[PDB]
Design an enzyme around this catalytic site. Sequence first.
Site, PDB file in Angstrom:
ATOM      1  N   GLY A  35      -6.827  11.168   7.624  1.00  0.00           N
ATOM      2  CA  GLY A  35      -7.619  10.276   6.789  1.00  0.00           C
ATOM      3  C   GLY A  35      -7.635  10.715   5.336  1.00  0.00           C
ATOM      4  O   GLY A  35      -7.332   9.930   4.432  1.00  0.00           O
ATOM      5  N   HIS A  66       0.806  -1.219   0.000  1.00  0.00           N
ATOM      6  CA  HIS A  66       0.000   0.000   0.000  1.00  0.00           C
ATOM      7  C   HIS A  66       0.840   1.270   0.000  1.00  0.00           C
ATOM      8  O   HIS A  66       0.280   2.377   0.081  1.00  0.00           O
ATOM      9  CB  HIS A  66      -0.968  -0.014   1.197  1.00  0.00           C
ATOM     10  CG  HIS A  66      -1.830  -1.243   1.246  1.00  0.00           C
ATOM     11  ND1 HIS A  66      -1.467  -2.386   1.930  1.00  0.00           N
ATOM     12  CD2 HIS A  66      -3.006  -1.530   0.638  1.00  0.00           C
ATOM     13  CE1 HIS A  66      -2.397  -3.309   1.769  1.00  0.00           C
ATOM     14  NE2 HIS A  66      -3.340  -2.818   0.986  1.00  0.00           N
ATOM     15  N   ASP A  71     -17.991  19.576  13.513  1.00  0.00           N
ATOM     16  CA  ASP A  71     -19.363  19.872  13.884  1.00  0.00           C
ATOM     17  C   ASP A  71     -19.602  19.252  15.243  1.00  0.00           C
ATOM     18  O   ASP A  71     -18.725  18.590  15.805  1.00  0.00           O
ATOM     19  CB  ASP A  71     -20.357  19.341  12.854  1.00  0.00           C
ATOM     20  CG  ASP A  71     -19.832  19.466  11.441  1.00  0.00           C
ATOM     21  OD1 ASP A  71     -19.862  20.595  10.915  1.00  0.00           O
ATOM     22  OD2 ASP A  71     -19.355  18.453  10.875  1.00  0.00           O
ATOM     23  N   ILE A 116      -3.799  13.979  12.984  1.00  0.00           N
ATOM     24  CA  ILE A 116      -4.540  15.220  13.187  1.00  0.00           C
ATOM     25  C   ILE A 116      -5.761  15.133  12.283  1.00  0.00           C
ATOM     26  O   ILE A 116      -5.626  15.076  11.055  1.00  0.00           O
ATOM     27  CB  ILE A 116      -3.691  16.463  12.879  1.00  0.00           C
ATOM     28  CG1 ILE A 116      -2.898  16.270  11.590  1.00  0.00           C
ATOM     29  CG2 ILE A 116      -2.691  16.715  14.001  1.00  0.00           C
ATOM     30  CD1 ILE A 116      -2.145  17.492  11.174  1.00  0.00           C
ATOM     31  N   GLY A 117      -6.951  15.080  12.885  1.00  0.00           N
ATOM     32  CA  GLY A 117      -8.148  14.735  12.149  1.00  0.00           C
ATOM     33  C   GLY A 117      -9.335  15.570  12.580  1.00  0.00           C
ATOM     34  O   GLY A 117      -9.231  16.441  13.445  1.00  0.00           O
ATOM     35  N   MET A 125     -13.061   7.787  13.795  1.00  0.00           N
ATOM     36  CA  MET A 125     -13.064   6.439  13.237  1.00  0.00           C
ATOM     37  C   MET A 125     -11.683   5.797  13.105  1.00  0.00           C
ATOM     38  O   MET A 125     -11.558   4.768  12.427  1.00  0.00           O
ATOM     39  CB  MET A 125     -13.760   6.447  11.864  1.00  0.00           C
ATOM     40  CG  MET A 125     -15.236   6.822  11.929  1.00  0.00           C
ATOM     41  SD  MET A 125     -16.153   6.665  10.379  1.00  0.00           S
ATOM     42  CE  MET A 125     -16.151   4.886  10.132  1.00  0.00           C
ATOM     43  N   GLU A 126     -10.641   6.344  13.724  1.00  0.00           N
ATOM     44  CA  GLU A 126      -9.309   5.767  13.523  1.00  0.00           C
ATOM     45  C   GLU A 126      -8.427   5.720  14.769  1.00  0.00           C
ATOM     46  O   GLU A 126      -7.509   4.893  14.807  1.00  0.00           O
ATOM     47  CB  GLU A 126      -8.545   6.529  12.423  1.00  0.00           C
ATOM     48  CG  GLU A 126      -9.068   6.342  11.018  1.00  0.00           C
ATOM     49  CD  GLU A 126     -10.192   7.320  10.671  1.00  0.00           C
ATOM     50  OE1 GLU A 126     -10.074   8.522  11.006  1.00  0.00           O
ATOM     51  OE2 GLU A 126     -11.199   6.877  10.076  1.00  0.00           O
TER      52      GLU A 126
HETATM   53  O1  HPA Z   1     -19.951  12.641  13.097  1.00  0.00           O
HETATM   54  C1  HPA Z   1     -18.855  12.127  12.854  1.00  0.00           C
HETATM   55  N1  HPA Z   1     -18.622  10.808  13.213  1.00  0.00           N
HETATM   56  C2  HPA Z   1     -17.401  10.239  12.909  1.00  0.00           C
HETATM   57  N2  HPA Z   1     -16.425  10.970  12.253  1.00  0.00           N
HETATM   58  C3  HPA Z   1     -16.646  12.263  11.891  1.00  0.00           C
HETATM   59  N3  HPA Z   1     -15.886  13.186  11.248  1.00  0.00           N
HETATM   60  C4  HPA Z   1     -16.601  14.335  11.144  1.00  0.00           C
HETATM   61  N4  HPA Z   1     -17.814  14.137  11.714  1.00  0.00           N
HETATM   62  C5  HPA Z   1     -17.865  12.864  12.187  1.00  0.00           C
END
Ligand code: HPA
Lengths: 233, 233, 233, 233, 233, 233
Positions: C20, C4, C204, C88-89, C180-181
């Site tokens: 990501g 990869h 948000d 950093i996400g 998610m990571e």
């Molecule tokens: O609401 C969320 N959930 C998971 N990851 C995210 N990344 C931006 N918003 C979200």
Amino acid sequence: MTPHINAKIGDFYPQCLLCGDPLRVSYIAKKFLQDAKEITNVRNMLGFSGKYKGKGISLMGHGMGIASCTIYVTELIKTYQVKELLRIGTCGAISPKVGLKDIIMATGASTDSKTNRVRFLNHDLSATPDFELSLRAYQTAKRLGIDLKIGNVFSSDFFYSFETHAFDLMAQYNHLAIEMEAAGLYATAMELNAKALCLCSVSDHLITKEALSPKERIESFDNMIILALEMMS
Amino acid sequence: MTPHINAKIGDFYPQCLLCGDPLRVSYIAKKFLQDAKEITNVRNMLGFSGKYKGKGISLMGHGMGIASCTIYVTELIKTYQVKELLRIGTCGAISPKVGLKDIIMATGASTDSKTNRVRFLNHDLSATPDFELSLRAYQTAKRLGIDLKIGNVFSSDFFYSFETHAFDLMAQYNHLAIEMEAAGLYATAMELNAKALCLCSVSDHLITKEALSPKERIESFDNMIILALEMMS
Amino acid sequence: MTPHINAKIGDFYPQCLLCGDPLRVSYIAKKFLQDAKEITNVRNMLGFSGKYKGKGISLMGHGMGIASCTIYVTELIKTYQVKELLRIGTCGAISPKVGLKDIIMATGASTDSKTNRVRFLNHDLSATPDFELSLRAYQTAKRLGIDLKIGNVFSSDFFYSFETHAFDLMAQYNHLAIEMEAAGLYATAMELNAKALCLCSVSDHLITKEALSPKERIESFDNMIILALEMMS
Amino acid sequence: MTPHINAKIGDFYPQCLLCGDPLRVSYIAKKFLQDAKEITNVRNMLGFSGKYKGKGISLMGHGMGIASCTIYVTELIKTYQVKELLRIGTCGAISPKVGLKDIIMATGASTDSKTNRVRFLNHDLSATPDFELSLRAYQTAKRLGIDLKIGNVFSSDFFYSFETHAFDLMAQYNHLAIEMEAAGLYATAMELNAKALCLCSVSDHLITKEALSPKERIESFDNMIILALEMMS
Amino acid sequence: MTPHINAKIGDFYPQCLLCGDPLRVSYIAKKFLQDAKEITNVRNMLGFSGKYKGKGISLMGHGMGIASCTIYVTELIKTYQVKELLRIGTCGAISPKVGLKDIIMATGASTDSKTNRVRFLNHDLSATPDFELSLRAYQTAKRLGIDLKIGNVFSSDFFYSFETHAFDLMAQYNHLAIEMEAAGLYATAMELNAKALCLCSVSDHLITKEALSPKERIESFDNMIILALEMMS
Amino acid sequence: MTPHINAKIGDFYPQCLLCGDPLRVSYIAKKFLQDAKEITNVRNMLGFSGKYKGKGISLMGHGMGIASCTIYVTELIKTYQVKELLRIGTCGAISPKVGLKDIIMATGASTDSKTNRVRFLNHDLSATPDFELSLRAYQTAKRLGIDLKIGNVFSSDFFYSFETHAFDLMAQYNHLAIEMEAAGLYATAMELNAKALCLCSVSDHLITKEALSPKERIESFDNMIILALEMMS
Ligand code: HPA
Ligand code: HPA
Ligand code: HPA
Ligand code: HPA
Ligand code: HPA
Ligand code: HPA
């Protein structure tokens, strides 16, 4: 009062040190505190309040095991309004870079308990200390010249493990030692919005097979005690 | 020695009564035993050897929770060669079939702990007492006029349950009360080929919210103590 | 030289920032690095090596989800000799304790994934950052006047969640946001003995239902890029 | 009538013996009962009512596995008002404490099934028999000179096991043999407030790999039938 | 219109080919489609729309892992009204019934992920393709002269496995190869009432360690791209 | 021979039909086959061999529940060399896509059993039929003018469910009906490299509460029997 503490409300300062051994609690109260009074004694689980360098501090025993610790930490937070809880316990080393009497700061607490799955939707709760207490300890240990080993501990329901062949994987995943309350302390503090940190001194090495007597588990760990008092004051 | 018991090998009789509260262990020795000897006191957890009606008997505190109970029971069987272990503790009723002061004989101990899945292949271990011990309790109970309530108990990791709305289901499936060590006592004794039984006195009712006075706490306890001592002698 | 990553052994510096979105990796190499050279582009997942205030930094995209991230940091560490990894996400906040533009330092990453149970004996792995990285992060944030929000994140396998009724419980247990990571990054770095930390920008907020514009979506992300590049430098 | 029993309500006496094999059920009716009368035959699962020493006893087949046993005893309790259910089946010894031809009384029934976790909140239900039946079996065995072997069984979803290396562990934990229904019988009776007990004839030894000849199997079975009839009448 | 796709509603034909690699997506647009335009490129995950033999076909990259795939398949179905999703990816063989170059159709996707237990009541969701799709795939393969290898696939959260000793067990249970998305594709298409099917080209054999040279992989992919385009047209 | 089948090796043809109910096995042998011989009858679980369209075919009862089914199809495969196993059962519909009299072809079988987790590494086995058998079923129903409902079933350890609240979620995920054996037939045939498929006649609808009269039950069943015999010859 509560079913496991017979202190009056207001008898506890907002900062509390915790041990599993009430006899270690009592040794700290008589040796390191001024004007210490025994404020609780249900089931022989002693707790004290006194002063260290003019500042007030409390000490409480929490017994052995996540379920026992969770009982005392919940009552300390919900009835006696403790807000900072510093566990200073013992543990059995599984890392080869850690030896007897080393002090370990638990930056997370893994567990084979189910308590956290019950609490947290049957998912993985990552039980962690309050960062700021964690940094106070780093700074205070730096200032006192205490070499603090920093990593994860594994909070087990088993003092006599059925999974000794897994110790090498646990050490690989940066678990320095096994003990039996930190995951209970961290998860209850998280539930109830308090600040908790766990320090532990190596009384056993589970790889090289050394250990300490029931007496020197009370009295070989003065550096950890002073570290805890100094950072709470 | 072991890390949690400082007795000499040979100081325990092969039959031992057990309580979570080391003061309750203390009450039994001063009120019911002859030649009572204190044989251990690590972490304030007291144990005794004395005589009831000429017969040797030991007593040991084991603390709160499965993890803590498992520690003491493992060391009593493996190192001090104890063969029969009778837990006499307190519980909270969840069934309409039992009321305050009732004595419960636990013929099974369900649990929310993970300890038996870890022990028993990630399957369902059905934690149960020794049958001859339960028969002996029932014959001694009838011979004393005690009405034994006989069913399952639920051994929980939580004193402060997160699942109170499940108590009805538990009582449906013949769970009479909730305590915190029975499953641990039973599984350890099964592991190490020893004979165990848990008796529980209803000190609170968790559905009707009735409790007993600290005065009544003790005469109920006295009934359970004599039953226990009569069974073992 | 891995399935990869088509860079050559040596193309990567020992320190590496991660996102990501590989177009943020691209964005950071063009806007903040000198001598920005793209070293890998398998599956359109771009990586670079550059310099910031004179020192070699690398960048890499890891994709969405614990399984994708795990593939990338595994290959970074094992084959390309990376040693520090700073993700950093972006995240959706769930706690009242944080607002938008806020930067979160994840001191633990809880999860609904099974990956850690598979890694860690079907037990609970407390997935945590390297402590000296989170210390460096705290000091550097202090120095640039950024008020780090410090707590747990919840790393889910689900972007479109089936348990939105549980976000309160997460926030009660000190989960500030969802991504998610993190849990995969932390577990993989633990497994392979490298230093890792995850920082997150409140894009948000999933309880206030609030958000704001794509031009502001970049000022807050710039703050975090500077903090990240400062502490690696 | 129910989907698996085509008897009239009232055709069952409130006491019922059960085997997996309906031809064993038929055998008992023919050889031991007076005025024996077939009362159900859906799916060839035969049931009978009759008299032993002038008292009415019923007999019912329940097939193999927890799922099938559960169906038949749910209908016996709810529709046909059976109050006492005595399973007398065969089993495969795993413990050195029993041998071929022994009769086991199952004071607990562990399982690798998921059925009790679905019934019981995803916790560990300790599936146990009614204590008064247990006591009645104990006394009647003594009266007849039968050496009853008392402990747990393991009720498996598998006749052909995938875990033959765990048999020694199961025997260590006081599991004397493996059969396939006792946990379902026990859990269903607990659910529905009925009295259930399981007895088993050791017809195979899963460790030594020996089995009873056809004729020995019938002799061992006759002893258990007599014990069961004597205790129900 | 969605956080991960920036195409207008209507850019997608109701039938969509998917690959993990968005550069495989591109290659199919450029080499095989007529009038192929690019329609989405958030995070460098390319989608296209075009024509094959006069009929409309869309292409979409889904990334690696079940969590990534679930994001894209959820947004394709719910927002861009896609109705049939054909996944064509690479995989590592484990079975001796298949060799390199072989094309596999997944009649089920087993998994070590927890996503389906979260979705499906904590039971076993047997994730499977739409039957009519699998019938088209079969009849088309017969017409083209492709010998389809039909069986289960194992969808893992790990490219780098921790259970390589278990590949033989998987292959015994009719798992032809391992990949990382089908189970998420199948579960999501089942949740949202759409038709999905996964085909896979054998790139490596994880048992015999044999791999394909490039070109040879490019030519195996081509056979599958044409199978996939023929059966959609 | 085997412990649940007393036929001689060679008594079974390699193709074999299965029902839970041995009396339906008997009805099929007597009404649809020529030269029918009963070859097995342990535990009243009848099995047969006979001729249809001049070709040999066998029939076997397998009982209720995954555990029971697993016993019979393991022995049929391992000892009696049966190679194709076609289950024709009855089921309770839960989806609005199917009504009474419908015949369901099960392309997957979900379950609340633990059997497949125990078989398959504690991961998710997606239990599926042999594709070529399902293709044969489809073509034969086409020729016979039968409209096949194709989708998953849910194989339950429970006839009397504790989770009726969840039938709609099951139907959302393309589970057309509930029965009690398909998952065990599929898993065992996968284990032992045999070809299996399950067909089910819709006799009750668990949502609309509709049901077939006894007469209509046998006409629906006869339809399915003819489909099965035709595809098996
Ligand atoms: O609401 C969320 N959930 C998971 N990851 C995210 N990344 C931006 N918003 C979200
Ligand atoms: O060896 C140990 N194991 C678990 N907990 C401990 N606490 C002190 N020593 C130990
Ligand atoms: O109320 C109870 N709940 C749990 N444990 C107990 N031990 C005594 N009473 C109780
Ligand atoms: O071998 C056994 N296993 C399970 N059930 C049994 N019933 C008789 N023998 C056995
Ligand atoms: O070889 C493989 N193994 C695991 N996952 C994969 N995804 C593509 N190929 C593979
Ligand atoms: O509705 C049912 N549920 C389970 N099994 C069945 N067999 C016939 N009907 C049913």
